[PDB]
Structure 1
Amino acid sequence: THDLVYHSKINTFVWDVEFDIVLSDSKELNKCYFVKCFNPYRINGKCDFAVSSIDIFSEGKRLLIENEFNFKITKAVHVATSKDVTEIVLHLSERISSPFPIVKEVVYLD
């Protein structure tokens, strides 16, 4: 739990951690992770408001299509270095009000 760093200008916790995924539809995904991209200088010509280009990797190579906003839950989540951190992830998932509270490697393209 020494690799978790909270970022301020975007409500996110960076942590090299993989979480199993359960969404509203029956399709289920194994341990995966998110990558957020804070870009306030992004081309938003259309009705785009988000400053974060948030996407998902399944196994570091499998980027799944966004499609609908799946109602994902953290389920069992592993740091892949020390031990399972399920509580340590779910406890700070709330009181954030930002989608994908815990991601890995925010790119911070300014």
Structure 2
Amino acid sequence: KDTGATHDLVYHSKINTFVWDVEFDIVLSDSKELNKCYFVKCFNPYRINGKCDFAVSSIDIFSEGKRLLIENEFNFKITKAVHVATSKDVTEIVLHLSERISSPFPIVKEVVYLD
């Protein structure tokens, strides 16, 4: 459990989410494969909206270093995660922590507070 990479992890109770510098390789819907994907959450609870808007947070997905837009039902199943500092053994930590947190997308890279 003890490692030098975990010193960069932070916890924001406002969103009950973890923040860390890690990049993931994913396979979605058991039919699509994507490499080096990372995500960013933005806390805008009081944003202009209609009747169908119900969440305070909006999440955006980026495969590699470019924006990713997907319409197909979003299914997630982790296969590999790695630290930017070239540190391994993080897949088990990621799976464990994601199991602890019931909130969607337990781990992300950046959090933006607009309010």
- For Structure 1 versus Structure 2, the TM-score category normalised by the shorter chain is 0.7 to 0.9
Any gaps of 5 or more consecutive residues in structure 1? none
- Tell me which of 10, 14, 17 is aligned to 2:22: 17
Q: TM-score scaled to structure 2, two decimals?
A: 0.82
Offset at residue 85 of structure 1 (A) = 1.3
Q: Secondary structure at the match of 1:90?
A: helix
How far does residue 46 in structure 1 lie from its aligned partner after superposition?
2.8
| Alpha carbons of structure 1 residues 106 and 66: separation in structure 2 relative to 1, 3 Å | farther
Contact in 1 for aligned 2:38/2:63 (Cα 8 Å): yes
Once residues 23 and 89 of structure 2 are traced to their aligned partners in structure 1, the CA distance between those partners, rounded to angstroms, is 10
TM-score if structure 1 supplies the norm length?
0.85
Say if 2:42 and 2:112, in contact at 8 Å, map to a contact too. yes
Q: Does the CA contact (< 8 Å) of 1:36 and 1:107 recur in 2?
A: yes
Q: Identity over the aligned pairs, expressed in percent?
A: 100
Structure that is richer in strand per residue: 2
Consecutive unaligned residues of structure 2, counting only runs of 5 or more, are: 1-5
Q: Figure out how many residues of one structure are paired with residues of the other and give that number.
A: 110
Larger Rg: 2
Tell me the SS of whatever aligns to 1:94.
helix
Q: Is the 8 A contact 2:22 2:81 kept in 1?
A: no
What's the Cα RMSD here? 1.9
Runs of 4+ residues over 4 Å off in structure 1: none
Q: CA deviation at 1:74?
A: 5.1
Q: Equivalents in 1 of 2:9, 2:67: separation in Å? A: 24
